[model samples]
Target: RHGPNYNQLLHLLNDLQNHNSAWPFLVPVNRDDVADYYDVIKEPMDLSTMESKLEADQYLTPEDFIRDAKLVFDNCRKYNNESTPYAKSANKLEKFMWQQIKAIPEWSHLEP
Candidate 1:
């Protein structure tokens, strides 16, 4: 119902949601679920939040969408240890997101 890029962003988010590595990132981190989550994460981002923002027309550009998507991965890596499952999953998903988006003409010019 908005820019042409809306569909592209929607599909990208869908792809991320469908990913096998998305379990840990499907929803926002809850402080009740993890100890000291807010204290450590500082700024938490998740697929659900991204979805809500997109629905609200918050992703004015591909860069805006990418920033929050990238944040999810960064937050995971920051809180989880390198060898951990959550960290490993975030690494894989982040790589997949970049690879998928690299081919989109609008975002192709974006610096990796």
Candidate 2:
């Protein structure tokens, strides 16, 4: 359930971060700090499993997706929030992930 494609995850994260729609959540930080969050993207843990399950249509309702995605979202948030170096960019990435995850069909009902 761990390590699907760190590169893929990183690519998606960067894409979302760079997109104009994500402006409100984008927080400024040094290049080194941004790189640190990228380094933190190793396996994506529960997110990989949730994505696979959604792809396989193993879900009965949106709740499954929401629950799992929220777990991963919170995990990422806490990881960034607890970072000793405290980079705003890292937390911004976490928020970006939440936004992207909520954009998925199952979670679409959530308000922005």
Candidate 3:
């Protein structure tokens, strides 16, 4: 039950898991060594995350994943700070996302 874009990543992960597939899935009890690395919570699902996630999991529904991405992108386009560089950065990132999205045939079909 993975995302669609994550297929390649999953394959790689599976290959890595093949070396030791019988290991338990529970995390270690000691949180001391756990680095709370980049946790994107409640962040609007943008195209970058969408595409990356999809690549990592091919089973993800295209509609849900893409729609989430659109929501995030729209949020940024609609509410970004125009005077500062935030808006410009959003536009830049959006362009990158659109380019990647356009590269995929699935996304082009959504275009009008």
Candidate 4:
């Protein structure tokens, strides 16, 4: 009864399957703040979950997706130095997650 439109879902699934992420968001930033966090994370391939396939080497696997999602979620829990609510860097990270999540067919139209 509460299903998303099939075509829209299909389109989203197609997009994800064809144009999924390459690395976790915020990789390009690589600033000291972000770099410190990055160094702590380790796993070079882990960052690969941020980019879209078209944008990088390839999309993420289920394991990578889970790890990436958790990492981003934890990151989002922190307030930026500006003390704004998820603004700037966190906002960018969240937006990237939104892009990744919205690409999933089942939940694509769920409205991030």
Best by lDDT: 1
Rank candidates, TM-score, best first: 1, 3, 2, 4
Q: Residue-wise lDDT of candidate 3 within 5-94, one digit each (tens)? A: 465434432332232321211122123543431132234443335445555553355455545545554554454457555455545544
Winner on lDDT between 1 and 4 is 1
lDDT of 2 by residue, 9-37 (tens): 44444565475444433342334756665
Local distance difference test, candidate 3: 0.43
Query: For each candidate, what is the lDDT?
Result: 0.90, 0.49, 0.43, 0.43
TM-score on alpha carbons, each prediction: 0.93, 0.36, 0.43, 0.31
Estimate, for each residue in 25-82, the C-alpha lDDT of model 4 and write its tens digit: 4344355656565555443322334444213423233333445545554554442355
lDDT of 1 by residue, 1-112 (tens): 6876899999999999999999899998777888798998888999999999999999988899989988999999999998999999988998899888997877868765
Clashes per candidate, residues 3 or more apart or on different chains: 0, 0, 14, 11
* Model 3 TM-score (2 dp): 0.43
